[PDB]
Amino acid sequence: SGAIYVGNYRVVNRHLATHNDWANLVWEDSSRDLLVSSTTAQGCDTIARCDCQTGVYYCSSRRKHYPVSFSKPSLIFVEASEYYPARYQSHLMLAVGHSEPGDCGGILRCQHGVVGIVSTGGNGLVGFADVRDLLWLDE
Numbered sequence: 513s514g515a516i517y518v519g520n521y522r523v524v525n526r527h528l529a530t531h532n533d534w535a536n537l538v539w540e541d542s543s544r545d546l547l548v549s550s551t552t553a554q555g556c557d558t559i560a561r562c563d564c565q566t567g568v569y570y571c572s573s574r575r576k577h578y579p580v581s582f583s584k585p586s587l588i589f590v591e592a593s594e595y596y597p598a599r600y601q602s603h604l605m606l607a608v609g610h611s612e613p614g615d616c617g618g619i620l621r622c623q624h625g626v627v628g629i630v631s632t633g634g635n636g637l638v639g640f641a642d643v644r645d646l647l648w649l650d651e
């Protein structure tokens with residue numbers, strides 16, 4: 513699990529969004545595994561605005577932060593999970609590293625702030641849903 517808090521926005525894995533997230537929907541994209549809901553409290557996180565391909569992600573299944581190199585956001589085929597059928601996920605970045613389902617929502621960061629959240633994994637790969645293109649999160 514894990515969320516991003518910026519302005520009056522909460523960014524979560526679409527597959528982990530609660531009834532409260534859906535009752536306060538700002539935007540959702542099923543192909544990206546992302547959902548943003550409205551909050552009453554002011555978020556403390558900064559979204560990276562950059563095209564960095566190196567960073568550090570939190571891996572709850574190892575209680576550790578790992579430094580990774582990752583691909584630029586793209587359309588990648590993603591095998592079946594407990595939450596989606598096999599399909600193409602958009603705006604997805606891959607790194608070589610450890611990921612398990614409950615690692616979803618772990619934050620990837622560079623010097624410029626939050627890059628994205630863990631969304632896919634297995635076969636020694638971790639996939640992160642990019643949030644850097646969602647410029648409207650900042651105002």
Ligand SMILES: CC(=O)Nc1cccc(NC(N)=O)c1
Nearest residue numbers: 593611612613631632633634
């Ligand atoms: C370990 C494996 O094969 N599945 C895996 C790994 C990381 C994240 C997800 N994502 C998801 N279940 O939505 C799935």
Ligand SMILES: [Zn+2]
Nearest residue numbers: 562564622624
């Ligand atoms: Zn950056």
